[PDB]
Design a protein around this nucleic acid. Structure first.
Lengths: 55, 212, 170, 156, 130, 178
RNA sequence: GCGCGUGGGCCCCUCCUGGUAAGCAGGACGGGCGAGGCGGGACGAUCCGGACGCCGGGCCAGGGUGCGCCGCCGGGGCCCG
């Protein structure tokens, strides 16, 4: 018949067992959702002089 | 190179003989200075407030069962992981504020030099390579704390009693003191309500003497 | 049980470089409880919380107690109904010793513990000024009374294992 | 909750202040923003385009993107045991500059100023580390006029 | 016939750790089995229950396996097998196996007598003269 | 009795030994571990552990990778803890000393024909045990096909590929398919 | 990286919703039992202390100290637990 609809007890403990994990370091610098124009300029700018890896 | 162990012993022993003679005179200068300063104040209808405590001895009085998640974290940082364990703390606003959160699980106060020496010599053990090694000789203190300028055992007792610059390194060096059972009376009321938890002040020394 | 004169003042401020000093005569078991009571009072009477102020000096005043004097204590206790005011007189050698007798008779008769009772004042009253008869009867020059509890010499019988040959006379 | 639409439980959150209804002060648009700047997100109810969710109100973040009419902000949301960087695009009105690092920025410069003197006049350097209050000190205080205080008799 | 001096042998439990409920039923043999029941009083170690086998009961490594005579046991079945005890086994002692017949026990015991090796069962199967 | 779980992140297992039945690998690991213990050099510690790693952890380095990796430093000896496989695509291989656990037949011939030396871990222990004029080089560990298919294909930010043919349009034709 | 069990929970503390209420139903922070020996609460799953290898000595928590039943006295007040 009727069982528990919802509980939150222990869920915080379970989260903190090994958790509270910070989100990577690459994510903080990723170019996802950045301005398409700014990113094109960055590529053109870093494609000239010492930064350039074009050979 | 095998020799020089005796030469270090000579320098370490020399620092020890001079330090005990000088430190004891320093400790007796304090009583004369405080009593005279209080006399001078008394003549001028003034009160000499003494320095607010610089170091506290904190002893866990409750066990590991049912501890709150925050209280567990603060007591772990205070190096109190088992009942009857004692550690020295440096009195700062941050340390004092966190002690209030874990007051129900500990009793604390300001230790005398006599209490300091007895814990350091009877129950003192060191943390070397994360190992609890007995403090039976001045050589061990010198091999880990001479960088912090603490060649001898009296040099250690001074660092803790007078909260010196090398207090963080010297207190960490001492392994949390493991002491005998506490007499207690009420562990749930506070020394201010007649129980034993919380600040006991000078009475921390009396409590610790039974557990050495 | 002790008798202390706890001095205290709010921490110096830019507005008030020198703050007013308060002195309180507090009877308590220990210095730590005495300083708690001082701040319980200053928190309410002067709006000075313990963290706001500082205790300049806690001074234990010991007393000479070679002669019995009548100490009158005015106090306020919170009962199951609410706060009440009461004046109790106790004849004792020292003011700390009479505070013990007052807190013994406040727990026994009024069922009020030390933290419920707040002592307004303690002041020695002379024989002429005693307003309470339980203290007045003793103040008269000559008091002759039979031993109040002469049967209390049954302490002797615990040692005897209660195997005495004759029933002891009182 | 039985209804969980974009703007649920936002009656007092996205409401304007007592006397602060109306259009935005033009400084909100005028204030210059730079990439990596710390920005505090406080939603303004009047402007409805680019509105961050009620979760994003009260969250400090960094500007990943500076774009036409909109600032992309990276805020960290703890979902379960993992804190996740969430990249949101918020219009000018609902974002504000943050003074989070201002005390650090102030301290860095003050530390250098004392050090600059330590290189020149007064060569010894004062400790440039914050101290957590410390346990008072000694001092002699004149009891002189000390008011004798007594607990006052109960009134009522 | 005499071993190295050795350190006092201390046995943590003299008794043999009987299984639980082995007295009540003949079907339950006394060989120890870990109690593994949802409501097993033995596994909950409530007061008054039998003791539980654990590594804490282990004997000192230095004196373990040693027999009451201060010697360790090597089970010999032949006179060539008396070569283990021959290679300077001053600590060990020899037990002849049960299968070895009295004819062969006599030869093994003579070799042991020359070597000085102590034989634990030196009266075994010695019934008069065959 | 003692709360020892508040700040401790639990023991982390590592390969303190080579699980290899191969005698020669066990004999070399013990050999270089004894050197590391007596002389505490990083080169001998990294080699000691590299020998204990599993085959998947240790990938092959080709004779075209080693040529490119040692282009600036032909003098330095290239120490590989796996197998050197030849790259026929590199027509001409440069001459260098290489010390590897194994060398394929073609890769032993090509380096020797070039005038280079194929040394062995025993020759390294005898000639340069601490690692003077030597570089520890590794193959690409993510080169494994299995490594490429790890993940959750079907999640938006997976960039993985499904295991099996699939042959259908739901979830595969776009972020909005499904 | 591989994978298992689990997805009927229930109690305590405090904060709550429906109900006259319920050892009733439904929620929240932490803790506990589940899966926690042991001493106490006369008895009890969860209470109060304490969280466990095998032992010897010492200390003493909680709770008590007429006798069953280990361990108590001294002082002040009250009095048909």
């Amino acid at each position: 018949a009727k069982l528990k609809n919802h509980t939150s007890k222990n869920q915080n403990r379970k989260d903190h067992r090994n958790g509270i994990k910070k989100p990577k370091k690459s994510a903080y610098t990723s170019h996802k959702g950045m301005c398409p124009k700014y990113l094109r300029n960055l590529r053109r700018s870093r494609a000239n002089d010492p930064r350039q890896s074009l050979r | 190179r095998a020799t020089e162990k005796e030469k270090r012993a000579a320098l370490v022993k020399d620092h020890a003989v001079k330090s005990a003679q000088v430190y004891a005179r320093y400790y007796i200068d304090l009583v004369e200075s405080e009593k005279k300063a209080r006399e001078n104040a008394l003549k001028n209808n003034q009160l000499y407030v003494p320095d607010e405590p610089k170091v506290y001895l904190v002893v866990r009085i409750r066990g590991i069962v049912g501890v709150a998640p925050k209280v567990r974290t603060i007591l772990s940082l205070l190096r109190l992981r088992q009942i009857n364990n004692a550690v020295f703390m440096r009195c700062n606003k941050a340390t004092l504020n966190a002690l209030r959160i874990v007051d129900h699980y500990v009793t604390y106060g300001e230790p005398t030099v006599e209490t300091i020496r007895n814990l350091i010599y009877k129950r003192g053990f060191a943390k070397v390579n994360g190992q609890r090694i007995p403090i039976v000789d001045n050589n061990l203190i010198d091999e880990q704390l001479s960088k912090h300028n603490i060649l001898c055992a009296e040099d250690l007792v001074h660092e803790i009693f007078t909260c010196g610059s090398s207090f963080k390194e010297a207190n960490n060096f001492l392994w949390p003191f493991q002491l005998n059972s506490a007499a207690l009376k009420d562990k749930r009321n506070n020394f201010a309500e007649g129980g034993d938890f919380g600040y006991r002040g000078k009475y921390i020394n009396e409590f610790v003497a039974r557990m050495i | 049980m002790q008798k202390y004169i706890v001095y205290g003042r709010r921490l110096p401020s830019e507005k008030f470089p020198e703050p007013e000093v308060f002195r309180m005569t507090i009877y308590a078991p220990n210095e730590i409880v005495a300083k708690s009571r001082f701040w319980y009072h200053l928190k309410s009477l002067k709006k000075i919380k313990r963290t706001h102020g500082e205790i300049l000096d806690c001074q234990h005043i010991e007393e000479n107690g070679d002669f019995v004097k009548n100490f009158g204590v005015l106090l306020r206790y919170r009962s199951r109904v609410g706060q009440h005011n009461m004046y109790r007189e106790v004849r004792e050698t020292t003011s700390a010793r009479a505070m013990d007798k007052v807190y013994s008779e406040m727990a026994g008769q009024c069922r009020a513990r030390y933290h419920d009772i707040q002592i307004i004042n303690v002041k020695e009253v002379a024989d002429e000024d005693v307003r309470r008869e339980k203290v007045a009867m003793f103040t008269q020059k000559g008091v002759r009374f039979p031993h109040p509890c002469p049967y209390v010499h049954v302490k002797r019988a615990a040692r005897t294992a209660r195997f005495q040959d004759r029933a002891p006379h009182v | 909750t039985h209804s969980q639409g974009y703007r649920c439980k936002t009656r007092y959150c996205f409401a304007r202040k007592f006397r602060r209804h109306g259009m935005a002060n033009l400084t909100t648009y005028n204030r210059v923003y730079k990439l990596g700047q710390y920005v505090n997100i406080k939603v303004n109810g009047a402007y409805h385009k680019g509105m961050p969710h009620r979760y994003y109100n009260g969250r400090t973040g960094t500007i990943f993107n500076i774009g036409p009419r909109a600032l992309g902000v990276q805020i960290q949301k703890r979902v379960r045991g993992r804190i996740m960087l969430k990249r949101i695009n918020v219009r000018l009105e609902h974002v504000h500059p943050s003074d989070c690092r201002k005390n650090h920025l102030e301290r860095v410069a003050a530390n250098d100023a004392a050090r600059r003197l330590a290189k020149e006049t007064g060569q010894p350097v004062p400790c440039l580390k914050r101290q957590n209050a410390l346990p008072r000190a000694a001092h002699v205080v004149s009891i002189a006029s000390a008011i004798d205080i007594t607990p006052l008799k109960y009134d009522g | 016939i005499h071993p190295l001096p050795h350190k006092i042998i201390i046995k943590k439990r003299k008794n043999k750790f009987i299984r639980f409920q082995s007295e009540r039923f003949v079907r339950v043999k006394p060989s120890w089995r870990k109690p593994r029941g949802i409501d097993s009083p033995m596994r909950h170690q409530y007061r008054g229950q039998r003791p539980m086998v654990s590594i804490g009961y282990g004997s000192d490594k230095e004196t373990r396996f040693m027999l009451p005579c201060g010697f360790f046991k090597h089970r010999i079945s032949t006179v060539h097998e008396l070569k283990t005890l021959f290679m300077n086994n001053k600590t060990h002692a020899a037990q002849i196996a049960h299968g070895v017949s009295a004819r062969s026990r006599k030869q093994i015991l003579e070799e042991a007598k020359k070597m000085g090796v102590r034989v634990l069962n030196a009266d075994a199967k010695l019934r008069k003269e065959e | 009795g003692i709360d020892l779980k508040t700040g401790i992140k639990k023991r982390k297992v590592e390969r303190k030994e080579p699980k290899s039945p191969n005698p020669y690998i066990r004999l070399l690991h013990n050999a270089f571990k004894v050197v590391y213990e007596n002389t505490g050099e990083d080169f001998t510690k990294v080699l000691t552990k590299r020998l204990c790693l599993s085959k998947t952890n240790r990938p092959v380095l080709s004779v075209s990778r080693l040529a490119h990796l040692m282009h600036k430093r032909e003098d330095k000896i290239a120490v590989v803890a796996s197998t050197v496989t030849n790259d026929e695509r590199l027509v001409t291989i440069p001459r260098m000393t290489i010390c590897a656990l194994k060398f394929s037949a073609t890769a032993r011939s090509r380096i020797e024909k070039a005038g280079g030396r194929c040394m062995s871990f025993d020759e390294l222990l005898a000639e340069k045990p601490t690692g003077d004029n030597c570089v520890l080089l590794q193959g690409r560990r993510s080169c494994r096909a299995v490594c490429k298919k790890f993940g959750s294909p079907g999640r938006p930010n997976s960039h993985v590929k499904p295991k099996g043919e699939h042959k259908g349009r739901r979830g595969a034709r776009g972020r909005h398919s499904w």
